[PDB]
């Protein structure tokens, strides 16, 4: 699943609901982030899910769903959730965590961990991320191993960049955070700037004399 | 293509700063390596990323980790744009080899094409990929950011330190971990074997499930 591919629909069991979870129904007209984790009841996973449970409103208000995913059962997810709530000082769990016990979805998405296996000796997923647009396109991906917890701040920062550059002709520079100046895309002609920007462009002159180094403060 | 734990393939290519062929396995022998691509020379986000990694090059070399750049531009393009990068970063030299994939063979093989970005000729360009590669040529982590979205350079280093730490020690790093912070004991390490590996004591946190997996250790 290269960048720009269409993230496939699937139906699965999930935490906190009794019926079928269908992805496309859940994420219609929304950004989505689908994130996996190796095993329920393990420490790194608990810290990550507790953090994303805290940040869940920050995402929802940007019109972005969070969807969890592991190769554990529903009964595992539901019991483990009370651990995540306790660790994280949370009082309301809202992120659906998909179940993939058969590993069909994990094999199709190509997110298996290099190392981790459950108690039954069957393989488990790594820490994947898929950032998905309202049109079901994979805008960005990450595959972290079971050994290395994610940066939850980075997850919200990429999302903000993706949503900004979705509607405006800019790209966000190294280490950009919301509120910082961004870059004008290099193909945007100077005759074309005022149609798109209220504020002034800053030009930084380069030894090559090419005029591509332009910042804008939105 | 190249999932976690797969072997990163050898290649040989032209590169910035040298006039001979660059062979990947040669350059990274007995070394951690981070291979990072950018879409196009002479464009603004790319210049800021490369300046930053150039400033950070000593941080990486101290950890025994090679940085290797990559775009679908020629050598002549790379060499000239290097002077732009050096100017923007206030650098006096440049030592990261930037490989050339003008034919797009390597980028089609690595599956690092950007969804939208094209050059002046109409041909497609790479996204902003990262491959973290161990001394045995195994892919430990990857990231694919699009052209629209510059990477977090602090995060690249945080991940490398994490991958190096957990490579040799029975720990895993929790969410948002930085070097110096307590990390987690792997859930399968049993009690009898805890003091072979750890000088400092372990902290256990009680869970409603009464399971015993929530263990922190300060190294």
UniProtKB/TrEMBL annotation, chain B:
CDD domains: PRX_1cys
Segment forming the signal sequence: none
GO cellular component: cytosol
GO molecular function, one term: thioredoxin peroxidase activity
Positions where Cysteine sulfinic acid (-SO2H) occurs in the chain: 46
Active site: 46 (cysteine sulfenic acid (-soh) intermediate)
Gene Ontology terms describing biological process: cell redox homeostasis; cellular response to stress; hydrogen peroxide catabolic process; response to oxidative stress
UniProt keyword list: Antioxidant, Oxidoreductase, Peroxidase, Redox-active center
InterPro entries, alphabetized: AhpC/TSA, Peroxiredoxin, Peroxiredoxin_AhpC-typ, Peroxiredoxin_C, PRX_1cys, Thioredoxin-like_sf, Thioredoxin_domain
Domain Thioredoxin as annotated: residue spans: 2-165
Pfam families named among the record's database cross-references: 1-cysPrx_C, AhpC-TSA
UniProt superkingdom: Eukaryota
SUPFAM superfamilies linked: Thioredoxin-like (SSF52833)
Protein family membership: Belongs to the peroxiredoxin family. Prx6 subfamily.
Function noted in UniProt: Thiol-specific peroxidase that catalyzes the reduction of hydrogen peroxide and organic hydroperoxides to water and alcohols, respectively.
Name of the protein in question: 1-Cys peroxiredoxin
């Amino acid at each position: 699943y290269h960048l720009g591919a269409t993230f496939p629909n699937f139906t699965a069991k999930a935490s906190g609901i009794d019926g079928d979870f269908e992805l496309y129904k859940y994420i219609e007209n929304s950004w989505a982030i689908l994130f996996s984790h190796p095993n329920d009841f393990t420490p790194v996973c608990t810290t990550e899910l507790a953090e994303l449970g805290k940040m869940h409103e920050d995402f929802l208000k940007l019109n972005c769903k969070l969807i969890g995913f592991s190769c554990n059962s529903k009964e595992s997810h539901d019991k483990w959730i009370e651990d995540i709530k306790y660790y994280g000082k949370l009082n309301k769990w809202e992120i659906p965590i998909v179940c993939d016990e058969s590993r069909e979805l994990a094999n199709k998405l190509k997110i298996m961990d290099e190392q981790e296996k459950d108690i039954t000796g069957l393989p488990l997923t790594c820490r994947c991320l898929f950032f998905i647009s309202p049109e079901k396109k994979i805008k960005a991906t990450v595959l972290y191993p079971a050994t290395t917890g994610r940066n939850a701040h980075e997850i919200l920062r990429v999302l903000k960049s993706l949503q900004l550059t979705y509607t405006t002709p800019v790209a966000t520079p190294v280490n950009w955070n919301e509120g910082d100046k961004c870059c004008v895309i290099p193909t945007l002609q100077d005759d074309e700037i005022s149609k798109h920007f209220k504020n002034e462009i800053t030009k930084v002159e380069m030894p090559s004399k090419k005029k591509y180094l332009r910042f804008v403060n939105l």
